[PDB]
């Protein structure tokens, strides 16, 4: 049996709402940490188990609140999640990668005792929005110890990331900021053919789709994190044989099926 498996058997409906774990938060002040701008930790409560960790970056001009719904959503399905604020709201994608690295170090070492007590530091992942998704791609390339990476409507001027970390990219069909033809799709195509990878494109969605409750983002992000952070094969069903009415594209090399 899988020692990292958490929660009841999933249904698709259950992955579109907060999950079976209650969630608490801890606010990490900007002045209290080195290498990033603080943020908010979301973590499961009412449980004696340990969970994988996820660090998430917002995009240009944005703060951690722009991903609060998703940090809480992931935590409620069984993850310790640190959504960062950046040193400057104007930091670029590679800077955001460096800050995600600093945030993962903080999460493992200097976060509250209660957070470390429910964190399995051996199982970590990253996600992020826009330039924060660019940072997710870069840290995945720099840090093959990561279990998974989920760039959401990502933006970066570099298009090729030589990473072995399994990547699921969410593109937005109606994105006029990081259009999928110039950003998300090239990122997917240029990843190594040997790295497990998925691209999903949300029909009719804008660049700010990741900043509020979104059923498809919830399903695909939870499932990819579950499959790779927890080795939880019960989530393969949502990532294989896909026929999703909300998607206008789906690409994969089918290394996870």
Residue positions in the annotated binding site for poly(ethylene terephthalate)?
60, 131, 155
Catalytic annotation on 207?
A: yes
Give residues 28-57 in contact with Ca ion (rule: CB under 5 A): 30, 33
Beta pairing, strands 119-129 & 51-57: parallel
Annotated active-site residue 175? The verdict is: yes
Check 77, 129, 156, 207 and give the catalytic one.
207
Residue closer to Ca ion, measured from CB, 33 or 216:
33
Binding residues: 60, 131, 155
User: Are the C-beta atoms of 95 and 63 separated by less than 8 Å?
Assistant: no
Q: How far is the C-alpha of 41 from the C-alpha of 60, rounded, in Å?
A: 20
- Closest CB 87 distance from Ca ion, rounded Å: 6
- Least distance to Ca ion, CB of residue 30, Å: 5
Catalytic: which of 175, 223, 230, 256?
A: 175
The length of the chain, given as a count of residues: 257
Q: Is 181 a catalytic residue?
A: no
User: In sequence order, which residues have a C-beta less than 8 Å from that of residue 189 and are 6 or more positions away?
Assistant: none
Q: What is the smallest separation between the CB atom of 53 and Ca ion, expressed in angstroms?
A: 19
Count of other CB atoms within 10 angstroms of residue 54: 29
Quote the CA–CA distance of 43 and 62 in Å, as a whole number: 22
Kindly indicate which of the ranges 14-22, 27-35, 70-78, 222-230 contains the residues binding Ca ion, using the contact rule CB under 5 A: 27-35
Residue owning tokens 């206008």? 248
Binding residues for Ca ion, per CB under 5 A?
Answer: 30, 33
What positions carry a catalytic annotation? 130, 175, 207
């Amino acid at each position: 049996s899988n020692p990292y498996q958490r929660g009841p058997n999933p249904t698709r409906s259950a992955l579109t709402a907060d999950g079976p774990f209650s969630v608490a938060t801890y606010t990490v002040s900007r002045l209290s940490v080195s290498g990033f701008g603080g943020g908010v930790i979301y973590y499961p409560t009412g449980t004696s188990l340990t969970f994988g960790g996820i660090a998430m970056s917002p995009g240009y001009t944005a703060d951690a609140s722009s991903l609060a719904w998703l940090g809480r959503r992931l935590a409620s399905h069984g993850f310790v999640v640190l959504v960062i604020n950046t040193n400057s709201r104007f930091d670029g994608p590679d800077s955001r990668a460096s800050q995600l690295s600093a945030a993962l170090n903080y999460l493992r070492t200097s976060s509250p005792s209660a957070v470390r007590a429910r964190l399995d530091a051996n199982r970590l992942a990253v996600a992020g929005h826009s330039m924060g998704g660019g940072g997710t791609l870069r840290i995945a390339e720099q840090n093959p110890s990561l279990k998974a990476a989920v760039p959401l409507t990502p933006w970066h001027t570099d298009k090729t990331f030589n990473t072995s970390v399994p990547v699921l990219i969410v593109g937005a069909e109606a994105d006029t900021v990081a259009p999928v033809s110039q950003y998300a799709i090239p990122f997917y195509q240029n990843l190594p053919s040997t790295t497990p990878k998925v691209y999903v494109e949300l029909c009719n969605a804008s660049h700010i789709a990741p900043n509020s409750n979104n059923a498809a983002i919830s399903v695909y992000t939870i499932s990819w994190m579950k499959l790779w952070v927890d080795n939880d094969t019960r989530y393969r069903q949502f990532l294989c044989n896909v026929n999703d009415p909300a998607l206008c594209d789906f690409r994969t090399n089918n290394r996870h099926c």
